[PDB]
RNA sequence: CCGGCCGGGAACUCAAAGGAGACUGCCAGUGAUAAACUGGAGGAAGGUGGGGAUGACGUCAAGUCAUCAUGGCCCUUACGACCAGGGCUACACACGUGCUACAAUGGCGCAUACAAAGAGAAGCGACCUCGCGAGAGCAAGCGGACCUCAUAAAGUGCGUCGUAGUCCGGAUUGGAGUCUGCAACUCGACUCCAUGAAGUCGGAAUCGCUAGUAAUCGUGGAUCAGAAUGCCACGGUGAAUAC
């Protein structure tokens, strides 16, 4: 293994950051755990609500928390209802009060995470891995996407002896720092083990 | 007479709550002793990258932390309601008195 | 060699030393307290010092005072 | 890393402030030129883990007692995992 | 030019000459030539008998030489008698202080052969 | 008005002020001698006045901080030829050939995980 | 040197006299980058040599250096099985990079008290070619010339 | 109050945001009238300027079930859980990685000039005072370009040592102490007095480094109550050599 994480090396440039708050040495840790505690609960909840990314901020003695989903309604519930029962517990876990916006995922086929997640959720469903990989890569090149690669790994279909197998269609310059690359991950928990999904989606540049 | 300390890890941002504050003053009361840049303290965290062994691997991260001073000389009650209530920028730490 | 301000000893031991002074020694005397400094009020007793697997007998004497109870109960069996 | 080895460290922070810092500063001055009446130190028969420095310092997420870092309360393994997903504000792979 | 022990040292600066005694480690020698009222960089030529035996008293003060040797070797037995750790160690020819012995305990363990 | 040149070298920054006058030289409020004019490179502060004459034609009072003995005496040396600025660009051509114009960019190179010091590589034995 | 042939930094001619040549000398005798204390030891041996020879300073150095100066050296050449020592006519510029190195290196392995002394005694012994260093010439000669056969 | 210290001063040093700049593009030679190299110009920087980050498809069933995760397997009043004391620190040996030396390019005393870069509230700790000392009491400032850590060392000047197992070297051990910590026996670091091994430059063999590098010199940091010769980072002085 020897590929710099694609998202990571971009943060400074072209890629964002899924936490943005400021804190000093003291509370910096206490915050991290909080954050990784809220993204924890929330992801187990909106699991079947196609969530692709959750940002956090703590605007002075308060916690904001945006939730990038490709099923905005399902997250929000009957006229606000759900978001309430979230905010509720999300403030119970942050130790402070909690707003909680719900960003919309246009063209989810373009989100690496929601891509992987489906491929993951397809193996658990019990589907051909070559098939899923190929659906993914298509409806993607379809709705734009100057490129995409998805690879899987480990007992593909059942093998006693494990494999990787990828699919690079288009352009995916992982060495260009300008290049917009949405890179994410998801693991299938199957009856014969655990299958790792990486997906790269090449969007543009500058 | 009154100065406000600004810090945040993002730079292309802190000076846009600075130049913002500054503006929201030289418009109203004013005076304002410009925005001072000031030592950007940068920590560095250097850690081993392989789960097991390989002491030569290692990733080398840092955290820059930028400052700005402000200083406002003439404190007009309008200027004083001009910071107040017109502020924002969630990831920016601001310090009022000293 | 440390301490400087009040030599150290475990209670349940030091009270196991006065349950024999006023009384007159019994059999040995078990302590795991390899910690404690030895006091003049222990000379003549036999204190059983744990070394890992059992308690080594140690007659206390007119110069095992500024020493630790553990000094007299070897812990690694080498030969 | 083994619930019980975790539970241990929780019991230790608990005691670490039920007594010590509180009941245990009765020793701070109790041992300082106020000479004497030996009952002073002797008092040390408290829970043991009551003492703060009986605490280890473990990756808040995993429990790893090694490769720990205060800023982030995590192990270098989880730290880099979060770092590459943004997740840790400000933090990027630095160079110079 | 003997002073103190059977030892007979001199023919160079004093402070260094004195060190010759078994019981002076510079610090003691500086305290001696000082409490004798003597310049420390002086040779012994000029150092007429007058000043010499004044020193002999200043050194007499401490348990130097043979008396030191005896005293010190006594203290090492005391250990061995008590049968404590630091003693058992002296009788074993291995380092008392705690130095590792898996390797490099050589000064104490004495040169290698088998 | 004062005629001036900066000049800085390896972590040292010296600021050099000129004024026609004597051949006297101050640095850090101190004699050329009294600072390092009696050490490794005393002669090199003078240097920048070679093809460009003096002995006591112009005065120069300077300060300097950062780096070390030769870094500080490097900066200053650079600031002199940079202040000989004022007296035209006709002299700052054999100040070029003198090598005094250039900014000595050689910095100290970083320690780097895996090595001992910049280049120094941990001895490795095969077995 | 597989390809990128190169030139050579040209150090700054001696701060006391104004000579590229000694700057090479000092740098050579120099150790643990102690230039300050390095040039001290050279001029203090040049001081004794200067007057102990009288005949100036500059030129006293050169004639003692004119000795240990070599003209031919044996460059190895591992070919078909044999190491084959091949004599080659050595450059003028190297001709004293050595000369200076053997002189400096000779005075180091020596018994006199201080290094300045030793240096002076090598300069001088060589002045009248009868030193350790001059023998390094009366040997690198011997070792070439024997392989004279080869050419 | 000869302290940038108070007025002040917006020049300069710097601070940190944004900008220009270097392109073989300009002269020339070389080469197919090419690519390129070469030398010159100007220029802070000439030929990817210096450094970093960045590690393709893949090779070694290479390493990690003990970071975490996880298919399968096994234990379940024991393969789990609690506590005390011990051990991971053992010692005939062998190998790897390092630290300190063997000394006058040095040791020592005294005087004295010049860095960079980090760290800090359950913290950094000034001052004053006591202690030869490690430290101790008391106590100010500072979440810190403010205050503290903190007086860089090589170096320079004088003087001393005079080639000796030495005024080189500091092991080992006796004695007595300091601080942390519930606790310094096993096994903490440090100090004072004494102690003064091996070691006079290292066989066969073998490693590093092409320039602000090697070599040498001090400084900080993570972990951390305490516990660095290791690790990570910083500048000081500063080479030799490449047909
Ligand atoms: Mg577990
Ligand atoms: Mg600990
Ligand atoms: Mg060894
Ligand atoms: Mg590239
Ligand atoms: Mg294995
Ligand atoms: Mg499981
Ligand atoms: Mg171990
Ligand atoms: Mg010595
Ligand atoms: Mg040597
Ligand atoms: Mg350096």
From Swiss-Prot, chain A:
Q: Which InterPro entries match?
A: KH_dom (IPR004087), KH_dom-like_a/b (IPR015946), KH_dom_type_2 (IPR004044), KH_sf_prok-type (IPR009019), Ribosomal_S3_C_sf (IPR036419), Ribosomal_uS3_bac-typ (IPR005704), Ribosomal_uS3_C (IPR001351), Ribosomal_uS3_CS (IPR018280)
Q: Which keywords accompany this UniProt record?
A: Ribonucleoprotein, Ribosomal protein, RNA-binding, rRNA-binding
Q: Which SMART domains match?
A: KH
Tell me the domain of life.
Bacteria
Gene Ontology biological-process entries? cytoplasmic translation; ribosomal small subunit assembly
Q: Belongs to which family?
A: Belongs to the universal ribosomal protein uS3 family.
Purpose: Binds the lower part of the 30S subunit head. Binds mRNA in the 70S ribosome, positioning it for translation.
- The name this protein carries in UniProt is Small ribosomal subunit protein uS3
Organism, per UniProt? Escherichia coli (strain K12)
Query: Which gene underlies this protein?
Result: rpsC
Curated annotation (Swiss-Prot), chain D:
Task: Give UniProt keywords alphabetically.
Answer: Ribonucleoprotein, Ribosomal protein
Record keywords: Ribosomal protein included?
yes
GO biological process terms held by the UniProt record: cytoplasmic translation; ribosomal small subunit assembly; translation
The protein here is known as: Small ribosomal subunit protein uS14
Q: Looking at the keywords, is Ribonucleoprotein present?
A: yes
| One GO MF term attached to the UniProt entry | tRNA binding
Which GO cellular component term is one of those annotated? cytosolic small ribosomal subunit
Q: Outline what the protein does.
A: Binds 16S rRNA, required for the assembly of 30S particles and may also be responsible for determining the conformation of the 16S rRNA at the A site.
Organism field: Escherichia coli (strain K12)
Its assembly, as annotated, is: Part of the 30S ribosomal subunit. Contacts proteins S3 and S10.
Entry similarity comment? Belongs to the universal ribosomal protein uS14 family.
Swiss-Prot record, chain E:
Listed Pfam families: Ribosomal_S13
Taxonomically, which superkingdom? Bacteria
One annotated GO biological process: cytoplasmic translation
Q: Which InterPro entries match?
A: Rbsml_uS13_C, Ribosomal_uS13, Ribosomal_uS13-like_H2TH, Ribosomal_uS13_bac-type, Ribosomal_uS13_CS
Record has Transmembrane as a keyword = no
Q: Does the keyword RNA-binding apply?
A: yes
SUPFAM superfamilies the UniProt entry points to: S13-like H2TH domain (SSF46946)
The record's PROSITE patterns line, in alphabetical order, gives: RIBOSOMAL_S13_1, RIBOSOMAL_S13_2
Q: What does this protein do?
A: Located at the top of the head of the 30S subunit, it contacts several helices of the 16S rRNA. In the E.coli 70S ribosome in the initiation state was modeled to contact the 23S rRNA (bridge B1a) and protein L5 of the 50S subunit (bridge B1b), connecting the 2 subunits; bridge B1a is broken in the model with bound EF-G, while the protein-protein contacts between S13 and L5 in B1b change. The 23S rRNA contact site in bridge B1a is modeled to differ in different ribosomal states, contacting alternately S13 or S19. In the two 3.5 angstroms resolved ribosome structures the contacts between L5, S13 and S19 bridge B1b are different, confirming the dynamic nature of this interaction.
For this chain, the family text in UniProt reads:
Belongs to the universal ribosomal protein uS13 family.
Assembly description: Part of the 30S ribosomal subunit. Forms a loose heterodimer with protein S19. Cross-links to the P site tRNA and weakly to the A site tRNA. Forms two bridges to the 50S subunit in the 70S ribosome, contacting the 16S rRNA and proteins S19 and L5.
Name of the protein in question: Small ribosomal subunit protein uS13
UniProtKB/Swiss-Prot annotation, chain G:
Q: Name one GO cellular component term.
A: ribosome
**Keyword line:** Ribonucleoprotein, Ribosomal protein, RNA-binding, rRNA-binding, tRNA-binding
What result is annotated for mutating residue 115 to G?
A: Significantly decreases affinity for its own mRNA
Q: Name one GO biological process term.
A: cytoplasmic translation
Molecular function (Gene Ontology), one example:
tRNA binding
Q: What does this protein do?
A: One of the primary rRNA binding proteins, it binds directly to 16S rRNA where it nucleates assembly of the head domain of the 30S subunit. Is located at the subunit interface close to the decoding center, where it has been shown to contact mRNA. Has been shown to contact tRNA in both the P and E sites; it probably blocks exit of the E site tRNA.
Q: How does it assemble?
A: Part of the 30S ribosomal subunit. Contacts proteins S9 and S11. Cross-links to IF3 and the P and E site tRNAs.
Further comment found in the protein's record: The strain K12 sequence is shown.
Family label: Belongs to the universal ribosomal protein uS7 family.
This protein is called: Small ribosomal subunit protein uS7
- Tell which residues of the whole protein are contained here: 2 to 152 of 179
